[PDB]
Ligand binder design. Sequence first.
Ligand SMILES: Cc1nnn(C)c1-c1cnc2c3ccc(C(C)(C)O)c(F)c3n([C@H](c3ncccc3F)C3CCOCC3)c2c1
Ligand SMILES: Cc1nnn(C)c1-c1cnc2c3ccc(C(C)(C)O)c(F)c3n([C@H](c3ncccc3F)C3CCOCC3)c2c1
Length: 108
Amino acid sequence: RQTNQLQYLLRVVLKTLWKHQFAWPFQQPVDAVKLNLPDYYKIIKTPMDMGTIKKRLENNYYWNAQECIQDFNTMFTNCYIYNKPGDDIVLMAEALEKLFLQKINELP
Ligand SMILES: Cc1nnn(C)c1-c1cnc2c3ccc(C(C)(C)O)c(F)c3n([C@H](c3ncccc3F)C3CCOCC3)c2c1
Ligand SMILES: Cc1nnn(C)c1-c1cnc2c3ccc(C(C)(C)O)c(F)c3n([C@H](c3ncccc3F)C3CCOCC3)c2c1
């Protein structure tokens, strides 16, 4: 719901997630080629990462907060859909999502 919440998502939510030790694989799109993952983009049709979210927040792409929250949803959900439970990347996405939930509770 406009600018204040979107700035809170940039300055508080994204910043806290970005600075976490577990952030680095989510800071840029999944490079399925470098990672030797032939079926990533056969399974994942809507890729999403925090680098893209950061750019969208910085260039006023979003109409409202919820559209940004959907991008965070897509990023966490893609990871859960593609990978097995117990995979390290899933545990990292789960810990980032826990931190995301702690921050979006104080959403103005
Ligand atoms: C998947 C997958 N599903 N959702 N996401 C977000 C990812 C994903 C995205 N980016 C990366 C990534 C980027 C660079 C490098 C190196 C090479 C260090 O520059 C990696 F290693 C990377 N790996 C590893 C990785 N995952 C799967 C297969 C091979 C592989 F290396 C993770 C192995 C477990 O600990 C964390 C990193 C990623 C996994
Ligand atoms: C409640 C509640 N009462 N009725 N309904 C239907 C919901 C409801 C149901 N599903 C979701 C949901 C699913 C995944 C993810 C992530 C984590 C992105 O995958 C969410 F964020 C989600 N949130 C957020 C949310 N709501 C409340 C507390 C935490 C929280 F994150 C909304 C915050 C405002 O913008 C829209 C999403 C939901 C709220």
